Amino acid sequence: QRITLKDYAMRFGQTKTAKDLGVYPSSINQAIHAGRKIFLTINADGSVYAEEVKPFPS
Amino acid sequence: QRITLKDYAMRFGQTKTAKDLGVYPSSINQAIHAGRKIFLTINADGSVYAEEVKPFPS
């Protein structure tokens, strides 16, 4: 099902995570450290859909 | 049995790996990137024994 950003990066590595999410490695690293609740869905076509769940208001 | 340095760091994290090996995180990171063949034995008392296998001469 959905995979946490942290678990994904551990499994697939920082480079692949960054490229799959369209961001720089620093963005991945910072979001993991921040403890943001980010969940990744691996799509059949190899694309990866990342979303964040956070309290409102920010 | 023995665990690779890379797998250990993935499992236990960079901080714990560094402190268990008595080095700075940068030393762990550099050795993983270098692809050095480093193997860790988890001892019963919680100490961790790391050794490197490398061609001779260096």
Swiss-Prot record, chains A, B:
InterPro entries membership: Cro-like (IPR000655), Cro_sf (IPR038202), Lambda_DNA-bd_dom_sf (IPR010982)
Keywords: DNA-binding, Early protein, Latency-replication decision, Repressor, Transcription, Transcription regulation, Viral latency, Viral latency initiation and maintenance
GO molecular function: core promoter sequence-specific DNA binding; DNA binding; protein homodimerization activity
Effect seen on changing residue 31 to W: Loss of dimerization
DNA-binding positions: 14-33
UniProt-listed GO biological process terms: latency-replication decision; negative regulation of transcription by competitive promoter binding; negative regulation of viral transcription; release from viral latency; response to UV
Pfam families per record: Cro
Function description: Plays an essential role in the switch from lysogenic to lytic state and in fine-tuning the lytic phase activation. Mediates the de-repression of the lytic promoters from repression by cI at an early stage of prophage induction. Turns down the expression of the transcriptional activator cII, a factor that initiates the expression of repressor cI, the major component promoting latency. Additionally, cro is able to directly bind to the promoter region of cI thereby preventing the transcription of cI repressor.
Subunit structure: Binds DNA as a homodimer.
Protein name: Regulatory protein cro
Gene name linked to the record: cro
